[PDB]
Amino acid sequence: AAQTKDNNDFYDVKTKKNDFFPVQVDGIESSLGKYEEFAKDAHEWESWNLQNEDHPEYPVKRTKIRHFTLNFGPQHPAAHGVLRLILELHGEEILRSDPHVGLLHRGTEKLIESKTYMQALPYFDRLDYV
């Protein structure tokens, strides 16, 4: 529902709620100078990172990966005929099931209107054909 800055079709920027105190740190310095004196070169210094990846609000752009989507399609012994059951799996655990039908839709209801009541009777033999 709606494409937003932190959540859209292609990626999201997920941030958890902050459990810890919002601690304020100001006046960062080393023994040779203040932070702003070397911040130009601090991009190459991993020990000079001010953002910690364990923080709940650390920005990460994660691509929205399709979950494992399986066509339990018509060509399958489990499906009793023509059923394109679309399953989104987490390993083998089912997360969402989308039964696609109409692979055996033959317009019986439309055809029946063109037939007399006697002529339309054999159509019923072929709905539940056991």
Partner 1 sequence: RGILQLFGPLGLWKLSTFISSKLNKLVFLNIGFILEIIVLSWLLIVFKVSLLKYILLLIIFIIL
Chain positions contacting partner 1, by CB under 8 A: 32-33, 38, 41, 44-48
Q: Which is nearer to partner 1, 30 or 69 (CB)?
A: 30
Residues 15, 57 contacting (CB under 8 angstroms): yes
Instruction: Please state the closest distance from residue 57 (CB atom) to partner 1, in A.
Output: 22
22-47 residues labelled b (16+ CB within 10 A) or e (exposed): eeeeeeeeeeeeeeeeeeeebeeeee
Q: Which is nearer to partner 1, 60 or 101 (CB)?
A: 60
Instruction: Please state the closest distance from residue 42 (CB atom) to partner 1, in A.
Output: 8
Residues 70, 63 contacting (CB under 8 angstroms): no
116-125 residues labelled b (16+ CB within 10 A) or e (exposed): eeeeeeeeee
Instruction: Please state the closest distance from residue 40 (CB atom) to partner 1, in A.
Output: 11
Q: Which is nearer to partner 1, 60 or 89 (CB)?
A: 60
Evaluate the CA torsion angle 73, 70, 96, 78 in order and state its sign.
positive
72 phi, psi to nearest 5 deg: -80, 55
Instruction: Please state the closest distance from residue 44 (CB atom) to partner 1, in A.
Output: 5
Q: Which is nearer to partner 1, 53 or 125 (CB)?
A: 53
